[PDB]
Amino acid sequence: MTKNVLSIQSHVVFGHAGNSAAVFPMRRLGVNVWPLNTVQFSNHTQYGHWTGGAIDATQMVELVDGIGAIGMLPRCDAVLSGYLGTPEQAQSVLEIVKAVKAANPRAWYFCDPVMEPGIQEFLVRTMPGVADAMAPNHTELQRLVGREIETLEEAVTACRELIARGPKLVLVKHLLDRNSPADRFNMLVVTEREAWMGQRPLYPFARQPVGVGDLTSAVFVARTLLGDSIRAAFEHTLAAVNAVVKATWQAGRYELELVAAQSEIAQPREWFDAWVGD
Amino acid sequence: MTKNVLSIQSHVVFGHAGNSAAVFPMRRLGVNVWPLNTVQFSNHTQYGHWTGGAIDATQMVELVDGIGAIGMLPRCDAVLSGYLGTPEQAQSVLEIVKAVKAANPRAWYFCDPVMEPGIQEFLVRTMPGVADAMAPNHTELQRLVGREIETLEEAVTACRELIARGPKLVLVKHLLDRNSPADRFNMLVVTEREAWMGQRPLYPFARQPVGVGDLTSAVFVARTLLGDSIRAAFEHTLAAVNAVVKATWQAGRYELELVAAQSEIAQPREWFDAWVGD
Ligand SMILES: [Cl-]
Ligand SMILES: [Cl-]
Numbered sequence: 001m002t003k004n005v006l007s008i009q010s011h012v013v014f015g016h017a018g019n020s021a022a023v024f025p026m027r028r029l030g031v032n033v034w035p036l037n038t039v040q041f042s043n044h045t046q047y048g049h050w051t052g053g054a055i056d057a058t059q060m061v062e063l064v065d066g067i068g069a070i071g072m073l074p075r076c077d078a079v080l081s082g083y084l085g086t087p088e089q090a091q092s093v094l095e096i097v098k099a100v101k102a103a104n105p106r107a108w109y110f111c112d113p114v115m116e117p118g119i120q121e122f123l124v125r126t127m128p129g130v131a132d133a134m135a136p137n138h139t140e141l142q143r144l145v146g147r148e149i150e151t152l153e154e155a156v157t158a159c160r161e162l163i164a165r166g167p168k169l170v171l172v173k174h175l176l177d178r179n180s181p182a183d184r185f186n187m188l189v190v191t192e193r194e195a196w197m198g199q200r201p202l203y204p205f206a207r208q209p210v211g212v213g214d215l216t217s218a219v220f221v222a223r224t225l226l227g228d229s230i231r232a233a234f235e236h237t238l239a240a241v242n243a244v245v246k247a248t249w250q251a252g253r254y255e256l257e258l259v260a261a262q263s264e265i266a267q268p269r270e271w272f273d274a275w276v277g278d
Numbered sequence: 279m280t281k282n283v284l285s286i287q288s289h290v291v292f293g294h295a296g297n298s299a300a301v302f303p304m305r306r307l308g309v310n311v312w313p314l315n316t317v318q319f320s321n322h323t324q325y326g327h328w329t330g331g332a333i334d335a336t337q338m339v340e341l342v343d344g345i346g347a348i349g350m351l352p353r354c355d356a357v358l359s360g361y362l363g364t365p366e367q368a369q370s371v372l373e374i375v376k377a378v379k380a381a382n383p384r385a386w387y388f389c390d391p392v393m394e395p396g397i398q399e400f401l402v403r404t405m406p407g408v409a410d411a412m413a414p415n416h417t418e419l420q421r422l423v424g425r426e427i428e429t430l431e432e433a434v435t436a437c438r439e440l441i442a443r444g445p446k447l448v449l450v451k452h453l454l455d456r457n458s459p460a461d462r463f464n465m466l467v468v469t470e471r472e473a474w475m476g477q478r479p480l481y482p483f484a485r486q487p488v489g490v491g492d493l494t495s496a497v498f499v500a501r502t503l504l505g506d507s508i509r510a511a512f513e514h515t516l517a518a519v520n521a522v523v524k525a526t527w528q529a530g531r532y533e534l535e536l537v538a539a540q541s542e543i544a545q546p547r548e549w550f551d552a553w554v555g556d
């Protein structure tokens with residue numbers, strides 16, 4: 001039996017961002033994905049211009065109503081959200097998660113709190129109470145606890161403070177460590193009982209590829225649904241992101257080499273061992 | 279260098295149809311896909327009810343304008359279309375193909391002519407003049423030449439008549455052969471110089487899975503872009519569709535087992551040799 005994730009993110013026709021970065025890696029790992037596209041744009045916004053449009057917040061919920069009407073919502077094992085442009089879209093995600101958990105009480109919500117008036121406020125004040133897992137980057141974690149974080153102890157303490165508000169797991173998808181060499185890319189994952197740090201090479205780019213955070217959350221969600229332990233899912237995520245970003249760097253590209261490097265999403269060749277962060 | 283296909287088809291959030299059937303298999307085979315979603319529905323229409331909506335025809339072209347504005351249209355190696363609900367959407371596909379070929383004269387258009395007033399007429403009267411390849415099923419082929427087809431000779435003759443109008447290749451994605459056993463599923467591919475017949479087992483279903491034709495066209499497009507000969511692309515398509523439909527049948531499912539059977543999209547275990555159809 002194949003697991004199912006409802007992924008509620010942006011769609012771009014060209015390139016990779018949002019669902020265009022997240023759906024294929026999760027499928028390639030062996031998990032089904034129901035992509036609810038909150039927008040359809042020609043390309044991601046870091047090119048500086050794009051065409052297309054967003055669906056409205058009520059239409060998001062209506063799509064999930066349709067899935068419910070054909071009897072499929074109990075099959076949803078997880079909900080994943082990432083960048084949302086408006087608080088109205090975030091409210092629809094809340095409504096959708098409630099509907100999914102009513103149909104399947106075992107379902108969990110993985111909120112990647114990517115940070116219009118009200119959207120930072122929504123992610124900080126409201127989403128922790130409904131998310132089973134959150135995946136902030138370093139600056140998003142600082143906003144979630146309302147203070148600066150520069151040590152590993154401060155990072156773990158902050159994650160545990162956020163966990164006390166509801167989430168059972170915090171994935172710091174990029175951790176800044178003032179004591180770490182500048183050519184290393186650090187990550188951290190924390191639960192009530194566990195804390196794991198990990199590190200991969202940082203590849204240099206003139207402009208940062210879009211979608212690395214979306215890929216990170218997607219691989220972690222898929223490996224978790226496939227039954228990995230916290231540490232195993234974390235290490236596979238670190239290694240898979242390493243493989244894709246390395247391949248992007250090696251080819252001198254800007255858009256992630258997701259299709260070209262797909263074998264190493266599923267079976268990364270270069271592995272990085274996590275270490276105890278507590 | 280990875281090839282790129284612009285795939286202009288429906289999107290369904292749950293299940294597989296249109297781009298939800300076509301995008302993942304092409305990516306899994308090693309080709310990039312730019313999905314231009316003509317609609318976003320909750321699920322495919324053979325459940326009998328759905329929610330969601332279509333984008334308008336002008337918005338389709340505007341998405342491609344955006345890709346052109348960031349300089350990417352010369353990278354498009356093929357355009358793929360399948361089911362279109364309105365002649366206005368079909369006209370937008372025509373406009374898009376013209377723009378793509380202006381940016382890249384080597385690009386080709388693969389029209390799966392899935393058959394509102396005017397859409398059969400458009401596919402029969404207008405699309406042959408612009409499509410480099412068409413993938414009708416048996417009844418669509420009969421409509422394209424305006425007569426009944428029951429022998430293999432009649433099928434090859436009909437394909438060659440259609441080729442004389444413009445297309446260089448006709449993939450009959452399901453060929454009805456009155457002389458073939460009822461538990462066989464036949465296909466045919468014809469060019470000016472070649473004709474290949476092939477056959478796989480027909481798996482019995484209470485209701486036919488949606489997306490088999492979309493999967494067929496997608497695998498054939500991807501294998502062609504990867505450099506396969508006509509016969510090689512045809513055989514890989516036959517074997518990959520066999521693998522997915524067999525896995526769907528074996529699990530007693532209705533929606534195609536695309537993710538579960540993905541290894542056999544790329545490397546089918548059971549192979550069927552084509553034979554000369556001329
Ligand atoms: Cl950060
Ligand atoms: Cl995909």
Ligand SMILES: [Cl-]
Binds near residue numbers: 415416418452
């Ligand atoms: Cl038919």
